[PDB]
Each structure stands twice: as C-alpha cells, then as structure tokens.
Amino acid sequence: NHKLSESDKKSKLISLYLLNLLSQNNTTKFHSELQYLDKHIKNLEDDSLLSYPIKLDRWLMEGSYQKAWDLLQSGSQNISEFDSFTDILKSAIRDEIAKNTELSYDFLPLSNIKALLFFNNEKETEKFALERNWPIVNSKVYFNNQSKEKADYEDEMMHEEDQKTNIIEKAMDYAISIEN
Amino acid sequence: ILDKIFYGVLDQGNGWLYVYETPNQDATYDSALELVGQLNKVVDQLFEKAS
Amino acid sequence: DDFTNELKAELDRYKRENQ
Amino acid sequence: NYEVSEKAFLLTQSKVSIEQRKEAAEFVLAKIKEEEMAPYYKYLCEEYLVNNGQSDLEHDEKSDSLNEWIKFDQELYNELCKKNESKIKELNEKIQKLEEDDEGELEQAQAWINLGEYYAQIGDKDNAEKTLGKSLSKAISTGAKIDVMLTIARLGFFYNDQLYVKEKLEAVNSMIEKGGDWERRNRYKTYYGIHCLAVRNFKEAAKLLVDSLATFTSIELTSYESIATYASVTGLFTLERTDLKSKVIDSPELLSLISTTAALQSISSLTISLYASDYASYFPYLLETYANVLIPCKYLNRHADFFVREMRRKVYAQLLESYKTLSLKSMASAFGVSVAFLDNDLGKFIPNKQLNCVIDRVNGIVETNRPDNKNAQYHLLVKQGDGLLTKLQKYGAAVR
C-alpha cells in the first residue's frame, strides 16, 4: 500500500532521478515520472524536495536560466547527495543556453558570455566556443552556424537540393494517376 | 490620394516620397469568390440529402 | 471602458493648452 | 407608445443632470392619462432596479426613487378600471351584437384588431393575441394585413422584446407578399435594422437604413429624431469613406436632416472631420456622440463601448492608406491625446490582426504596412481557402 512507517521515507533520492533525467535534454520523460507518483497534491506538492525539480523545470520552460542556476548554488542540499547531479545538470543547462545564444545573439563580446553562462575563466570561455564551432574575433564573438544541414540522411524531403525542379513536376503527375 | 486621384505615398519621418503603381491588383481572387460561395452552399446542401 | 478614454482625454487637454 | 418608452428610458441611466429625469416625467404623466400604460407602467420596476425600480405601493413596498409618479395610488387604480371598461367591456358588447347579426366580414375582423390593441394597453397579452389570431384567418389582402402586423409590431417597441416579435412579423409578411407602398414595407425594413442592434449584426443593420428616407416618422411606433440617429450612426459605421462621399455627406434629405435638430452629431461632426482628415477636433466629437446620442437612445445604448472602440480603429485606417509613414510625436500629442492613451488603444488592435501597421519606439515613426499587389490573395486565400475545407471535412469524416 502507501503505509510502512514514513511511507516514501527519504524524498531526496526520488528527486535524484528527476534531476538527472534532465541532463539528457529529454523533457518528455520528466513529466511522465510525476504521473507515476500516487499523491500529486500530498507528497509531491507539499514537500519541497519532490517539488524542487518542478520549480526548477518551471523556470527552464519560462525561459529564465538565471533563477534556475541559483537553485543549484544557494540551496544547502547540494553538499552530499545532490552534488553529483549538480554539475552534470549545470553542464546540460549551459549546453541548452548555447542553442539559444546562436539565434538570439547575432554578435556578443567575450566578457558577456562569461557572465551569462556563469564562467570562472575567460580562457575557458573560448575553449567551449571551439567545440561549438563559434567564430572568435577581437572583443567579439559571432555565429556563422545559424544555417543547418546534414542531420542524418534525407532524400526528396525537407528542402532538397537537386530534386527541387523535379519534385514540383512530380507532384503535378501524382494527381493525374489518382484520377486514372 | 485617398480619393483615388493621385497615386503615391509620402514619408513623414524623412520628408521623402515613395512610388505607387496605378493598378493595385490583377484578376485572381475574383475566382475565390466563386469558391467561397460554393463551399457555403453546396456543402450545406450535402447534409440535407444525407439527413 | 468609457471612463478610461474620457479621463485620459480631459487630463491631456489641460496640459496641452498650457504649453 | 414609443414616446413613453423613450422618455422613461432616461430614468434608467442619468450621470449628469437630475432635471433630465423630471423633464422626461412630464411626458410620461401626460400620456398615461389618455392611454393606459399599465403594462409598461408596471414594467418600469421590472426593467432596471436600484434607481426608481423599488418604489411601489402595491406589489412590493419600498421607497427609493427620484420620481414619485411611477407608484400606484387610489387615482390610478380607479382609472385602470375606467379604461378597462370602456375599451373592453363597452366595446365587446357592441361587437358581440355584430357577430349574431352577421354584419360585414372584414369589418368584424378590423373591430377585433382595434379591440385586440386595447388588451395590449390593459396589460393582458393573452387576450390580445387571442383576438388577433382569430382575425388573422380573415386577413387576405393588404387591408387587414397592415392592422394585424401593426399589433405585433407594437410588441417589439412597447414591450422591448426582440425574440417573439420578428418571428411573427416575418410569418405575416411571408404569407402574402405585396407590401402596398414603400412606407408600409418600412415596418418590416425599419424593425429589421433595429433588431440587428440587439444581436450585434453591425453592417447588416444599415443595409435597409441607408436607402431609407429621413422623413419617415411612425409616431406611436417611433419618433422623428429617434430614427434619424439610427440611420446616421449605423450608416456611418457601415459604408466606408468611398461610399460616404456620394451618399452620406451629400444627400438631399440628410443635409436637410442635420439642420432640423442638433442631436445627431454624426453626419456633420464625425463625417466632415473624417473627410477633411482633421483629428484635432474629431476626438471630442466621439464623447458628444456617446453621451448625447448613444446613451439617450434605446437600442444605441446596448453596445456602448462597442461604438467608440470600433470607430477609432477604422478612422486610423483612413490615415494609414494616405501615408507610408507617420509621426508618433504628432499622433500622441498634437491630436489631443497622450502617449499612454495611444498605446492602450493600439495595444489590443495589433494582436487581433485587424490592421497592418508598424509602430516605432525609439524613432517614433508610425509606418503603414501595404500589401501592394498582395491585397486579398495573400493571407485571405490561404485562411478562407483551407478554412472552408475544414468545414467540408466535418460531414465527410464522420459520415452521419
């Protein structure tokens, strides 16, 4: 049933799975585990430990990564158990911000990237730009990667190259055979 | 200009002028009027035959 | 409503006529 | 019957002058002596409450009013029986003798209609429609058809009911379609545009009102100045400036109508300022049109804010078509408004996709987005084209 002594007893280990699941950038399985809990408004809503990933993901969906980053620092639960999933989830948050900084920032200097993503070193800031293929000039960082291509294999679908002229004529020949 | 006498539009910010050609439309959407009137009548007539 | 549009129109007239 | 409903409507809402309620009470006291207003006189406390609606000495006992003439007394109770005996008891005895003697055919039907009109003034609508239904079978030509339609037409103006009236007026008109002259057809045409104000049909109301004459006066059904405000306000909102120049602003009757009374303030103040594109004095005309026209009128008070809010959106469209760009400093200051007031009106209009415009913050330049050759084939052809295909799939996906 639900009753042994303390029921779920430790609430921190249950929240470890919800915090570590977001490190893979999967938002579908995050809300699926919340439905698995028997009491949504009793154990999940009242206790701040089970409500920690909900309030953390709430700021992630609203778009604010600065308030979500403060929960992994000012919180006193990051000492022992949550220390393992702190830096791992923080690395996934910074990687998620990097996807936003491409489209939302046409040009940004080097000093701001350190402050926005909470970097402790300017040389380490440029190291992250090399793995993400970010062009670097004096006191500025541009993005030439806004254009996308490759993405596994695709043929005659999603903005083709040399078949554009044919597919337009092929779509006209498909309706003729349906009537015939 | 609003009376369809002179054709053009001005610029208040820079004090400039812009070019506006005389015809504003060809004949295209006039065929869509026959489509909207058909889908608002014949479609409603289909249920009268079924029911 | 009408109270919002009428109030902002009268308050601006007192300031505009004094300029 | 409309003279009382028009004056007593000012009793509902008066935000300025108290004398407006006492002046309108003089017309009510004069009409209740000649004809019994008891159905509407009792409807006064059943219409709008918490002003004069709590004062009655008979059914419900409370005293709160600015008008003490709407309460029953020993005089109106005796006059209610005197008007009930003469218009019903005395007349029905003479009609009963004509039924046994078999005098005429349409004369007995017309006598039942005139008798049926008296039940409407006594406050009994059961016998009013009962005597009217018996005379309906005797109606063939337009002689007895006008009187039958006249009784039902009173139900809309006198009782302020938009539901059971139009359904009966359409059935009588569609049974035998002749119309007589053009004025007898107005009873169906004028009430049509008036009913459109209850369900908010907007441009549908002015279809028959703009083509209607300005000299039409139905007296007990409607007044001269009342119908003048209906065609002027609704007709201006319907036809765009292209149709205003050849119809509204230049008309033989309309130019004669604006000079008759100053209570219009539509085809003069609003039309000239729109034609001359003067926005300095155009804004205070909307306040005078709202207070002195929309509020005192019956069916023009139902929309309220739906007039000024919609009319201000369309007047900007006339300015956007005459310029590619504009000046924010001139629109938010020189026209008589403020900066916060302009952002509040245009704040709700932009997300509704009601107009195409470019608003600037730092530069302060209001720019018009012009489709050029796009016109109606850009966003309308895809929305209306695929939107009707969704309605086509409704009955084809689920079959029956």
Place this chain on the structure above:
Amino acid sequence: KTIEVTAEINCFMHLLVQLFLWDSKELEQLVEFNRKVVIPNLLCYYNLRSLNLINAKLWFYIYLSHETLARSSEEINSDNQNIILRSTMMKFLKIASLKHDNETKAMLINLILRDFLNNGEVDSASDFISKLEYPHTDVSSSLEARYFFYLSKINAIQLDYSTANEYIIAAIRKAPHNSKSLGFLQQSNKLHCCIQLLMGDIPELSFFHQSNMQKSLLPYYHLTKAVKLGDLKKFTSTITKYKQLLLKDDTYQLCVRLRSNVIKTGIRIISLTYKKISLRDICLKLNLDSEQTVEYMVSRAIRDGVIEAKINHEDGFIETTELLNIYDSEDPQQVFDERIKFANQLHDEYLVS
C-alpha cells in the same frame, strides 16, 4: 458449443446492465464472481460470429468504482482482481490472430492507457502505440471518438500538440448520442481547448459558449485573459479557486506548462514591431515580471519558434522581427508543397466514393 455458450451469455449480458451503474450487488463477492464467469473459454477458439458478445463496452465504468474507496480504500497497493484483469487483458491480445479483430483490440488498450492517466507511468504507453495502431473497421461511432480522445491526451503529456491535433478534430465531430454530447463532449472540448493552451492561440468563446454549460466556461475565460495579457498574478489566483475542477480532469499540470505559455503568448500580444527595443521598455511592459527576466526570456522564445529577434548587450537593446516578407522565389514555394499535402487527405475520397 458456440450456440450453447452464446445462449448463456445472452442471459449474462442482461445481468451486466444491472451490474453497470444500476445494481452493484456486493463490493467484494461480485468482483470475484464476475471473473470466474468469463475466463472459462467464453472467447474460445474464435470459431464464427464472435464479437460484441464479451463484456467490452460494459466494463469500462465498472471496475473503476471498485478500485476507488470500495474494495481497496487505499488499504493495499493494487486490486488483486485488477492484477488478474491485466493478465487476462494482455492475454486476449497475445492470442489474437489480427484477422477479424477491430473493435475488440482498441477497447482493451483504453484500460491500460486510462490507468496510466491516474496512477502510473505514461512513458511505457508510447510502446503500446505502435501495437495499438490498426485500421479498425468495426469500431462503432460512439467508440471512435473515445479512441481518438486517449491518443490526443497521451501526446499532451509528451509535449506534442501537433500529432494530437489530428486526433482531437475527429473526436468532437463523432459520438452523436446525447450522453456522449454532454459529459463526454464537455470533457473532450476542454481537452481540445487544452491543445490551444499549448499552442498559444486560445480563441474566444463562440461555438463553445452554447455547446457546454457554464462549469467549463468560467476557468477557460479567466485563463484566456491571463495568458493573453501576460499576468502571472491573475493566473495564479485562477489555479487556486478552480483547483477542484483541475484535479478531476488531470489538468493540474497547467501550473507549469501553461504558465510558461503566459509569457510566450504575451510576446505576440505586445507590440515588438520596432527594431531596437531598449531594456527599460521591456522591464516596464508585462508588469514587473518582465523586469527580472529580459535576455534569457527572449533567448528561449526565439528557438522555440515564437518570434525571431537579436539581442545587443553593448547599447542595451534587442533587435526584433515580426516575420513579414514578400513572395518572390522561395517564399511562396514553401506553402506550395504544404497546400498539396493538405489536399492529400482529400485524395482518399476517390476510394471512399
């Protein structure tokens, strides 16, 4: 023995009408008695004319009452009768030859999906979707709307409103029955509006005003003005007062997802049309909630597909775009293949007619 078993079931289905919402007998012995009258080879070998004679439509609303505050009353982990029911349910589909099975295949999945909606994990339900998809020709018009109702709800938890869009359209058009047009339709219309909550449109009340009672109109009207105007204070007070209605429909999750849409929808409501938007003008707009979140708020909304903008920290403004262009070469050709794809759904009418 097909006629002998069918003749006995004809008298059994008449009792099941009493067992459904009418006469519940006992809350203990009956659930054990209804199990022993089914298992012993009522479905047999699938000989001939076997369908609609099982429980099927009858037991949907039965077993849910015995599980809640009847046999269990939160005294155990799960009903042992339901544990055996899950064994018999999944055994019925395992022994199915996928030949004449149409309506009976989709009804049993409705239980395993509904269980995951209250207590359970919906992540494993995605694996059943690949098995659940079949061209069922025997499903009655009453169950065609329910079959499309669960498929649209699972995708809502999966954060996809595009796939669930096609299923919810055909759900409200079906089930003409009165009971399905009152309780089932009002619950389905709120889920149809829930798709608009994740999309960001939230249209006004026109057809839905007279189609349903005022019970569902009050929360949707308050959430319409809260998400459009971008006010989290009014949006928070709506969840508290209407919490009673949010829990029974499993819509309580809107405190996170829909709360994030309050900001995204308010972006298109306010006018960003001008290019360079100063940081102070953004802080003043959207009450004080937009003052704390400025650069991060716009950064995620651009990648999500709401708007397209550019942020400049040097002079402290944000360059925004309203997505307005003119058709020249590749612009009008984007919807060219889409309008052809829109007609592909209508190309199947040749085989239907």
